Amino acid sequence: RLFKEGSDVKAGQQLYQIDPATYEADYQSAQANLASTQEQAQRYKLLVADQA
Amino acid sequence: ASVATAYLTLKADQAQLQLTKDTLGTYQKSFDLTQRSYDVGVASALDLRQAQT
Numbered sequence: 001r002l003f004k005e006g007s008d009v010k011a012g013q014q015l016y017q018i019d020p021a022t023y024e025a026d027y028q029s030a031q032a033n034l035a036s037t038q039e040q041a042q043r044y045k046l047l048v049a050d051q052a
Numbered sequence: 053a054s055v056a057t058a059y060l061t062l063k064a065d066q067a068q069l070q071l072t073k074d075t076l077g078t079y080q081k082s083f084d085l086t087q088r089s090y091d092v093g094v095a096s097a098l099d100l101r102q103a104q105t
Binding site: 052 | 090096097098
């Protein structure tokens, strides 16, 4: 728990951590897929200018 | 014998010349189709270059 009880809180203040590790796992997997496809799209964007 | 073989080589060369004319027409059609595919954007320039060769 990340708040003092009976106090005022603002919008967006974190209240609890719910131990992710699984959202962490599939976020890492999607990050790896993005890291491959982004540089592939950049290389094809470079090559498409001179019609390679 | 020499006159006979010379006339036969002339006729054979004329028939082979007609067939190479047909081959040139076929390659011209294929190069024009690859040029159309490259101008549209589906084929790359390398597929145009090999048809040119």
